[PDB]
């Protein structure tokens, strides 16, 4: 049975993030509305200690974050250098919110290490852009990195797969010099698009050369092509790297209807990627991430919880607290937008062939 990281206090904390208000409550409430919590093991998240956070993040950064958090000082002169600002405002309590999420992802990882489950879920995690000494991209603390480091206590090789719209740069950079963690990110890569890194030529550094895989994708990609790409890369990665555990970031900012309006995916296409990873039958840590159409993010992660459970869910959205957010259709399915796929078969083939060549080196 999957572990579901959840408490009422946790969700309420996660609801207060500035760029996704109420999202955690919408997600949890939809999953509950589908009765899926009755098929999972609910685990209260432990808050991350300063020591656990400092295995990745600098004390100076954490100390500054905790400082501005006390009263929500969004005007502190040092904040710019620590990445706090427009994307990452210093909201009152943000240190507590970020320690809670870090703690939730560590807890999930610990359940995995203890053999409590094969699948552990923290839909409020996946804040993949944070650097050791810098907030970035709505991320204040890199819970993914913290979860990966925790898994490294037991599991010899960790694969991180990042299906968020944006390049998982914080996680890649944290592990760019090691061969013990392989990072794989599929993302939009176009000059001017955040965070501006992760071209197919970025493969990591030193001993970690070839242990970073980047798949730059253009606007308008749909389920079928995305899965073809993902399966092709993951097939090769799996043979080459032989992971003992997986951390999977499933940001829903790829899904049609997202205000970012870049990719054109549905939850079913992402679910095929998820299904492919789950059949490896490795310890798997599931994270959320982006997702700025709040109802669609809940539709996505609810459907994906369903595929983790091997259930097909009713197409009718059940009555619940946020029912009205699901109009005008009130169904779980998401229809792709009618706009061009900007991905040319030839460019995709060059990218995949380049990646295949890089992975030949991974011994």
């Amino acid at each position: 049975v999957p572990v579901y990281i959840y408490s009422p206090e946790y969700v309420s904390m996660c609801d207060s993030l500035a760029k996704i208000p109420k999202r955690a409550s919408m997600v949890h409430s939809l999953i509950e509305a589908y009765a899926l919590h009755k098929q999972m093991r609910i685990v209260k998240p432990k808050v991350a200690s300063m020591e656990e956070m400092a295995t990745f993040h600098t004390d100076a950064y954490l100390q500054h974050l905790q400082k501005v958090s006390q009263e929500g000082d969004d005007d502190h002169p040092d904040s710019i250098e620590y990445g706090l600002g427009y994307d990452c405002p210093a909201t009152e309590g943000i240190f507590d919110y970020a320690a809670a999420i870090g703690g939730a992802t560590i807890t999930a990882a610990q359940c995995l290490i203890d053999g409590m489950c094969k699948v552990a879920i923290n839909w409020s995690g996946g804040w993949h852009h944070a650097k050791k000494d810098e907030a970035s991209g709505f991320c204040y603390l890199n819970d993914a990195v913290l979860g990966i480091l925790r898994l490294r206590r037991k599991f010899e090789r960790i694969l991180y797969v990042d299906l968020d719209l944006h390049h998982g740069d914080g996680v890649e950079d944290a592990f760019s010099f090691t061969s013990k963690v392989m990072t794989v990110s599929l993302h939009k890569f176009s000059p001017g698009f955040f965070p501006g890194t992760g071209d197919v030529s970025d493969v990591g550094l030193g001993k970690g050369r070839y242990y970073s895989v980047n798949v730059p994708i253009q606007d308008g990609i749909q389920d079928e092509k995305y899965y073809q790409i993902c399966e092709s890369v993951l097939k090769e990665v799996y043979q080459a790297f032989n992971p003992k555990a997986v951390v999977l970031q499933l940001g829903a900012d790829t899904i049609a209807g997202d205000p970012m309006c870049s990719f054109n995916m549905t939850p079913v296409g992402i679910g095929k990627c998820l299904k492919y990873i789950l059949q490896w039958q490795l310890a798997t840590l599931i994270l959320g991430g982006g997702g700025f159409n709040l109802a669609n993010t809940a539709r996505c992660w609810t459907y994906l919880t369903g595929v983790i459970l091997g259930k097909t869910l009713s197409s009718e959205i059940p009555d619940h607290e946020f029912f009205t957010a699901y109009g005008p259709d009130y169904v779980l399915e998401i229809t792709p937008s009618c706009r061009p796929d900007r991905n040319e078969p030839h460019r995709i083939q060059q990218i995949l062939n380049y990646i295949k060549g890089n992975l030949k080196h991974v011994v």
């Binding site: 427009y86 852009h129 955040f194």
Partner: peptide, 5 residues
């Protein structure tokens, strides 16, 4: 540095 957002 880029904006996100």
């Amino acid at each position: 540095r880029h904006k996100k957002x």
